[PDB]
Amino acid sequence: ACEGAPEVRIGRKPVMNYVLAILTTLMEQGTNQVVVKARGRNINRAVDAVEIVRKRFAKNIEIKDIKIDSQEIEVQTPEGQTRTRRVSSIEICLEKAGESA
Amino acid sequence: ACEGAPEVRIGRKPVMNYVLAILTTLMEQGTNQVVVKARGRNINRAVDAVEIVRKRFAKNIEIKDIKIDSQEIEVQTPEGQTRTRRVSSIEICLEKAGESA
């Protein structure tokens, strides 16, 4: 769901910055959706950012869809040994009511 | 969704223990659903546990539903000042195919 919507990826900056990006993005008249994405330890922070937004605008911003997934990352030793690890990810789509009211 | 299903709450034990609980629980003939729950920093770990399970049984265990929420926790100073903070949570319902095959 929410294919094409702009994306806010949770990085090193303070959760406060991503909340601002989410809100600023959603305040645009022609944009009613924004997806928040994160991997690994940042997943908790993605949820925090979304919950701050949800609780501030509990009446017009809904969590439309959530998906979790994981990626297999691998490296090869020079002698041909494969070493792998999985990294989890989360994607949360937030949708604002029609426009406002 | 998945009302009534048994619950695996992600705590201090190693993610490996919760994966075992999830699988052991799902291996029961009459139980096709299990909800994984976590709050705060443990949310990343809930996702990891679920992804380990999902990738090991990618063909018969599906993520049926996911919800995130947050709780307002508060304490009162003896002089009447309220101090609050929000704690995020996640609930993931895993469902196994009919029985097996």
Side-chain angles (χ1 to χ4, degrees), chain B residues 27-65:
Chain B
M27 277 291 88
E28 293 183 53
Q29 181 177 51
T31 70
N32 305 169
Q33 295 174 169
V34 62
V35 179
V36 181
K37 296 175 63 182
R39 301 198 238 68
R41 58 176 196 59
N42 278 163
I43 292 162
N44 300 329
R45 298 178 69 232
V47 178
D48 293 337
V50 167
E51 284 303 304
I52 283 170
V53 169
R54 262 244 56 175
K55 298 306 168 179
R56 181 188 297 190
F57 299 101
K59 301 177 185 306
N60 70 310
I61 297 179
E62 60 160 47
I63 296 175
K64 206 192 190 312
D65 180 64

Side-chain angles (χ1 to χ4, degrees), chain B residues 1-43:
Chain B
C2 309
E3 300 60 42
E7 295 176 34
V8 171
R9 292 164 178 290
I10 306 299
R12 196 69 176 58
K13 304 189 177 191
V15 170
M16 178 169 62
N17 174 287
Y18 299 115
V19 167
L20 182 60
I22 294 172
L23 295 177
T24 306
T25 297
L26 284 177
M27 277 291 88
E28 293 183 53
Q29 181 177 51
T31 70
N32 305 169
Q33 295 174 169
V34 62
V35 179
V36 181
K37 296 175 63 182
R39 301 198 238 68
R41 58 176 196 59
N42 278 163
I43 292 162

Side-chain angles (χ1 to χ4, degrees), chain A residues 8-99:
Chain A
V8 171
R9 292 164 178 290
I10 306 299
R12 196 69 176 58
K13 304 189 177 191
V15 170
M16 178 169 62
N17 174 287
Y18 299 115
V19 167
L20 182 60
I22 294 172
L23 295 177
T24 306
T25 297
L26 284 177
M27 277 291 88
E28 293 183 53
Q29 181 177 51
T31 70
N32 305 169
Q33 295 174 169
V34 62
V35 179
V36 181
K37 296 175 63 182
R39 301 198 238 68
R41 58 176 196 59
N42 278 163
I43 292 162
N44 300 329
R45 298 178 69 232
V47 178
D48 293 337
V50 167
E51 284 303 304
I52 283 170
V53 169
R54 262 244 56 175
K55 298 306 168 179
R56 181 188 297 190
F57 299 101
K59 301 177 185 306
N60 70 310
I61 297 179
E62 60 160 47
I63 296 175
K64 206 192 190 312
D65 180 64
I66 299 174
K67 296 196 186 308
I68 53 181
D69 203 341
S70 70
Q71 271 190 64
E72 171 125 307
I73 56 180
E74 72 172 59
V75 295
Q76 303 83 46
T77 66
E79 290 302 318
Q81 181 180 68
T82 293
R83 304 194 169 176
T84 67
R85 267 193 171 88
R86 294 228 74 139
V87 176
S88 296
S89 65
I90 189 165
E91 51 182 307
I92 303 162
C93 176
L94 295 180
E95 185 176 290
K96 179 183 179 185
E99 179 37 57

